[PDB]
Design an enzyme around this catalytic site. Structure first.
Site, PDB file in Angstrom:
ATOM      1  N   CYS A   1      19.196 -27.114 -13.205  1.00 28.08           N
ATOM      2  CA  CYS A   1      18.076 -27.441 -12.330  1.00 28.08           C
ATOM      3  C   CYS A   1      16.744 -27.117 -12.997  1.00 28.08           C
ATOM      4  O   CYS A   1      16.464 -27.579 -14.103  1.00 28.08           O
ATOM      5  CB  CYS A   1      18.197 -26.688 -11.004  1.00 28.08           C
ATOM      6  SG  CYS A   1      18.876 -25.020 -11.149  1.00 28.08           S
TER       7      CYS A   1
ATOM      8  N   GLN B   1      21.154 -18.233  -5.864  1.00 25.57           N
ATOM      9  CA  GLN B   1      19.842 -17.638  -5.752  1.00 25.57           C
ATOM     10  C   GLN B   1      19.508 -17.230  -4.328  1.00 25.57           C
ATOM     11  O   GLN B   1      18.589 -16.476  -4.108  1.00 25.57           O
ATOM     12  CB  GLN B   1      18.773 -18.562  -6.320  1.00 25.57           C
ATOM     13  CG  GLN B   1      18.546 -18.360  -7.784  1.00 25.57           C
ATOM     14  CD  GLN B   1      17.920 -17.029  -8.080  1.00 25.57           C
ATOM     15  OE1 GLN B   1      16.742 -16.838  -7.851  1.00 25.57           O
ATOM     16  NE2 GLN B   1      18.709 -16.100  -8.583  1.00 25.57           N
TER      17      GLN B   1
ATOM     18  N   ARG C   1      20.794 -23.639  -7.902  1.00 26.22           N
ATOM     19  CA  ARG C   1      21.562 -24.874  -7.706  1.00 26.22           C
ATOM     20  C   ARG C   1      22.652 -25.048  -8.784  1.00 26.22           C
ATOM     21  O   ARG C   1      23.778 -25.423  -8.470  1.00 26.22           O
ATOM     22  CB  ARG C   1      20.605 -26.072  -7.694  1.00 26.22           C
ATOM     23  CG  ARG C   1      19.685 -26.077  -6.459  1.00 26.22           C
ATOM     24  CD  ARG C   1      18.596 -27.129  -6.559  1.00 26.22           C
ATOM     25  NE  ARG C   1      17.446 -26.681  -7.356  1.00 26.22           N
ATOM     26  CZ  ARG C   1      16.328 -27.392  -7.528  1.00 26.22           C
ATOM     27  NH1 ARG C   1      16.192 -28.586  -6.948  1.00 26.22           N
ATOM     28  NH2 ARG C   1      15.330 -26.898  -8.262  1.00 26.22           N
ATOM     29  N   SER C   2      22.309 -24.772 -10.042  1.00 23.97           N
ATOM     30  CA  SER C   2      23.277 -24.832 -11.149  1.00 23.97           C
ATOM     31  C   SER C   2      24.477 -23.895 -10.932  1.00 23.97           C
ATOM     32  O   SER C   2      25.624 -24.293 -11.128  1.00 23.97           O
ATOM     33  CB  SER C   2      22.587 -24.522 -12.481  1.00 23.97           C
ATOM     34  OG  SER C   2      21.601 -25.505 -12.796  1.00 23.97           O
TER      35      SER C   2
ATOM     36  N   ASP D   1      14.894 -26.999  -4.045  1.00 24.09           N
ATOM     37  CA  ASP D   1      14.844 -25.700  -4.717  1.00 24.09           C
ATOM     38  C   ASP D   1      15.061 -24.590  -3.692  1.00 24.09           C
ATOM     39  O   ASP D   1      14.526 -24.656  -2.576  1.00 24.09           O
ATOM     40  CB  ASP D   1      13.511 -25.495  -5.435  1.00 24.09           C
ATOM     41  CG  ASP D   1      12.327 -25.610  -4.500  1.00 24.09           C
ATOM     42  OD1 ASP D   1      12.013 -26.753  -4.093  1.00 24.09           O
ATOM     43  OD2 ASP D   1      11.723 -24.561  -4.159  1.00 24.09           O
TER      44      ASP D   1
HETATM   45  O1  LIG Z   1      17.662 -23.567  -8.350  1.00 26.30           O
HETATM   46  C1  LIG Z   1      17.257 -22.899  -7.367  1.00 26.30           C
HETATM   47  O2  LIG Z   1      17.686 -22.951  -6.196  1.00 26.30           O
HETATM   48  C2  LIG Z   1      16.125 -21.883  -7.599  1.00 26.30           C
HETATM   49  O3  LIG Z   1      15.707 -21.913  -8.973  1.00 26.30           O
HETATM   50  C3  LIG Z   1      14.489 -21.333  -9.216  1.00 26.30           C
HETATM   51  C4  LIG Z   1      13.271 -21.984  -9.072  1.00 26.30           C
HETATM   52  C5  LIG Z   1      13.011 -23.456  -8.598  1.00 26.30           C
HETATM   53  O4  LIG Z   1      13.999 -24.247  -8.513  1.00 26.30           O
HETATM   54  O5  LIG Z   1      11.803 -23.730  -8.336  1.00 26.30           O
HETATM   55  S1  LIG Z   1      11.937 -20.979  -9.458  1.00 26.30           S
HETATM   56  C6  LIG Z   1      12.957 -19.673  -9.841  1.00 26.30           C
HETATM   57  N1  LIG Z   1      12.426 -18.497 -10.254  1.00 26.30           N
HETATM   58  C7  LIG Z   1      13.345 -17.540 -10.516  1.00 26.30           C
HETATM   59  C8  LIG Z   1      14.717 -17.700 -10.392  1.00 26.30           C
HETATM   60  C9  LIG Z   1      15.219 -18.933  -9.966  1.00 26.30           C
HETATM   61  C10 LIG Z   1      14.313 -19.978  -9.673  1.00 26.30           C
END
Ligand SMILES: O=C(O)COc1c(C(=O)O)sc2ncccc12
EC number: 3.1.3.48
Length: 297
Positions: free
Chosen positions: A214, A261, A220-221, A180
């Site tokens: 994800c 992200q 990641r998506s 993540d």
């Molecule tokens: O896919 C990613 O790199 C990030 O995705 C997120 C999370 C996770 O994977 O825990 S938690 C989160 N909160 C807000 C926006 C994206 C994400």
């Protein structure tokens, strides 16, 4: 040109700045449906919602809401559905969406548990003999087989509409080693995995859009879809220099917020596309190299 730009950004060490520029310019559309009180429990993250204009609607009268967006890339002529990891109460909706949208493939880029937390419900069966029935949406799901590699698993699932008894084969592509807010181990292991999805036929226009998720369905998506679309664009034109990665990302962000992200996921996207271009422009042998470098056995 991407490769020149890449070196230019590395040299000045300005990936954070470049990434923030994209964040600043990114589209902002309403997500009224997502924010309705009755949908609070259908959303995994308070700050991640589908835009109303691009949201996937479930074909039901009760509540048509799911946290999922259609990324329709007009110029590339490929569509993706990006969605959050389903919640314990939305696994039936998730599979309803797969059925109704006629998806052949589901791409999962997270693990069910990451950093001690449950980022996704166990929405598919882990054992052949223990199939799943989603009573709310009248769907049955059976594990048919799986092929476990070192960092990803490919599963063959049978999805059945219990109302009509029609059945479909769904392919599940599960990338198990992508952290993540992180990046894959190498361009090679990412590209090896993407080409597996491609080779399956799941991305064919003869199918409904592949489902990509994800946890939040944006980081990641977004990285997966951005790399794929950039390679496809390049492939259509047979011209790597015609592709503007930042422009493509901004187009994608018209359809779902927050795609990609971190600045390093953006930087990784460049690496993946630059390396993938070798295959596109007709060095087929590079595919074998990725397979080896990925250490999938
Ligand atoms: O896919 C990613 O790199 C990030 O995705 C997120 C999370 C996770 O994977 O825990 S938690 C989160 N909160 C807000 C926006 C994206 C994400």
């Amino acid at each position: 040109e991407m490769e020149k730009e890449f070196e230019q950004i590395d040299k000045s060490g300005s990936w954070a700045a470049i990434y923030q520029d994209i964040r600043h310019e990114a589209s902002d559309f309403p997500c009224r449906v997502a924010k309705l009180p009755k949908n609070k429990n259908r959303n995994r993250y308070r700050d991640v919602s589908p835009f109303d204009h691009s949201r996937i609607k479930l074909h039901q009268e009760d509540n048509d809401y799911i946290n999922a967006s259609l990324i329709k890339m007009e110029e590339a002529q490929r569509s993706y559905i990006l969605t959050q990891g389903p919640l314990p109460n939305t696994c039936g909706h998730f599979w309803e969406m797969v059925w109704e949208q006629k998806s052949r493939g589901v791409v999962m880029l997270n693990r069910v548990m990451e950093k001690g937390s449950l980022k996704c419900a166990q929405y598919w069966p882990q054992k052949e003999e223990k199939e799943m029935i989603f009573e709310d949406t009248n769907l049955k799901l059976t594990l048919i087989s799986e092929d476990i590699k070192s960092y990803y698993t490919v599963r063959q699932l049978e999805l059945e509409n219990l109302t009509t008894q029609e059945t479909r084969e769904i392919l599940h592509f599960h990338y198990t080693t992508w952290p993540d807010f992180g990046v894959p181990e190498s361009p090679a292991s990412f590209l090896n995995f993407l080409f597996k999805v491609r080779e399956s036929g799941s991305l064919s226009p003869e199918h409904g859009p592949v489902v990509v998720h994800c946890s939040a369905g944006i980081g990641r998506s977004g990285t997966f879809c951005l790399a794929d679309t950039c390679l496809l664009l390049m492939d259509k034109r047979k011209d790597p220099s015609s592709v503007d990665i930042k422009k493509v990302l901004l187009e994608m962000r018209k359809f779902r917020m927050g795609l990609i992200q971190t600045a390093d996921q953006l930087r990784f996207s460049y690496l993946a596309v630059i390396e993938g271009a070798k295959f596109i422009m007709g060095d087929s042998s590079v595919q074998d190299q990725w397979k080896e470098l990925s250490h999938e056995d």
